[PDB]
Amino acid sequence: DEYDYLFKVVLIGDSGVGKSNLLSRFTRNEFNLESKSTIGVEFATRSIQVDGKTIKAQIWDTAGLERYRAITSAYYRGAVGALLVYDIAKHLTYENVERWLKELRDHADSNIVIMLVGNKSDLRHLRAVPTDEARAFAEKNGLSFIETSALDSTNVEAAFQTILTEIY
Numbered sequence: 001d002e003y004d005y006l007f008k009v010v011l012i013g014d015s016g017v018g019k020s021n022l023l024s025r026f027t028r029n030e031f032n033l034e035s036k037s038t039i040g041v042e043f044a045t046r047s048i049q050v051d052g053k054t055i056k057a058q059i060w061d062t063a064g065l066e067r068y069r070a071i072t073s074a075y076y077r078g079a080v081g082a083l084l085v086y087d088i089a090k091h092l093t094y095e096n097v098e099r100w101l102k103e104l105r106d107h108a109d110s111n112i113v114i115m116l117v118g119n120k121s122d123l124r125h126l127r128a129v130p131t132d133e134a135r136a137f138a139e140k141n142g143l144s145f146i147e148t149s150a151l152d153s154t155n156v157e158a159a160f161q162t163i164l165t166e167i168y
C-alpha cells in the first residue's frame with residue numbers, strides 16, 4: 001500500500017525458538033504464550049522507513065521441523081534477509097544453527113543478509129547460550145547478531161529495523 005521497496009525476509013530456526021511470535025510481535029504487536037507448530041507457510045507484512053524511503057517488509061514463517069516435508073529453495077527465493085533464530089535457554093537450538101546455515105547455503109542466495117537472533121532474552125536466568133559465545137560465533141560466520149524477547153518486546157523492532165537497513 002504505497003512503498004519504494006519490497007524486501008522478502010524469512011524466519012528459520014528450530015521449532016519452539018519464537019519465530020512465529022517474533023513475526024506477530026513485529027507485524028501486529030501481539031504475543032501468545034501458547035505453543036503451536038506453524039502450519040504450512042505464512043507471511044505477514046509491515047512497512048517501515050529507511051533513508052526517507054518506504055520499505056515493505058514481507059516476512060515469511062514456517063515450521064522448523066523438516067522431517068516429512070522439507071523447506072525448498074522456493075521458500076528462500078528472492079529473500080534478501082534471513083532471521084536465523086535460536087532459544088538462549090535451549091542449547092540444542094543453538095547447536096543446530098550450523099544446520100540452518102547449511103540450509104541457507106544450499107537453498108538461499110549467497111549474499112543474503114543473515115541475522116542470528118538469540119530469542120527469549122527474558123529467560124536470562126535460564127540461559128544455556130552465553131551471549132559472548134554466540135556473538136563471537138556470528139562474527140566468525142559473517143552474520144549480524146542480536147538478542148530479543150518477543151514476550152517483553154525487547155529488541156524485536158531493532159532486529160527487523162537493522163536487518164532491513166543492512167539490506168537497503
Ligand SMILES: Nc1nc2c(ncn2[C@@H]2O[C@H](COP(=O)(O)OP(=O)(O)O)[C@@H](O)[C@H]2O)c(=O)[nH]1
Binds near residue numbers: 037152
Ligand atoms: N519466555 C519467552 N517465551 C517466548 C518468547 N518467544 C516465544 N516464546 C514462547 O515459546 C513458544 C514457541 O513460540 P513460537 O513463536 O511458536 O516459536 P516457533 O515454534 O519458533 O514458531 C511459545 O510458548 C511462545 O509463547 C520469548 O521471547 N520469551
Ligand SMILES: [Cl-]
Binds near residue numbers: 066068069
Ligand atoms: Cl515434517
Ligand SMILES: [Mg+2]
Binds near residue numbers: 019021036037061063
Ligand atoms: Mg512457528
